[PDB]
Amino acid sequence: AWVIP
């Protein structure tokens, strides 16, 4: 996997 888009 999860990221800050």
Next chain:
Amino acid sequence: AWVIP
């Protein structure tokens, strides 16, 4: 885009 996978 295009790459060698």
Next chain:
Amino acid sequence: ADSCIQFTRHASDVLLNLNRLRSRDILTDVVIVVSREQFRAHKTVLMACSGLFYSIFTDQLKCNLSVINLDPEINPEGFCILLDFMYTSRLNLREGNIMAVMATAMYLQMEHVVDTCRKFIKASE
């Protein structure tokens, strides 16, 4: 063949167009009912994202249904957040919705989401 070339953004571009079809109600083939709230969707996208929907739409009788009713304990907002994630890869996880989102992902059999919810809860304890 093993000499294929690959277009990096192709999968993301396909998902963007599948969400545009959903927004415009084009070729949607099922209504999911959650405590009287109704959500239109494409069976193939639901099956591709969820163990529960994969089992439902591969059944020889349920594959032909146009309406599927979920368990009355399922929260409509939690379902809405997960349906948006299926079609965009983005999850709107907030302090006020995390318990409902986690319980809904357990029911729908979306294990990456269940794991991330557990980690965010563990960090606040």
Next chain:
Amino acid sequence: ADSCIQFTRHASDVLLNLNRLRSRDILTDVVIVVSREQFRAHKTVLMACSGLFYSIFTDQLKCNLSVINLDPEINPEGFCILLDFMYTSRLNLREGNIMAVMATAMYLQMEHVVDTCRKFIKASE
């Protein structure tokens, strides 16, 4: 909301499961005929990948057809290569098939593919 988190591999995982449904002939809803060769597919995936299929399946009469016949000049191998690309992001481009793949991508209105074919041809001149 602007505070969403994103799962990097989600779009690729959805496309992998859509190709598994195609392999097993699950919920396919159209047959594309190319010089008597037949290819089963999902209308939503075809529309998401091609300007020609997007125009065909948004027409109020053609949206309900279960068989679509392509122009007799279209090469079946070129179509097969492009259908595999739609469902996997991988293009099997070879010296012996590039002219047919480019002409088929122009007809299907798949512009990224047309551009890449033009560049590979220009490099050999």
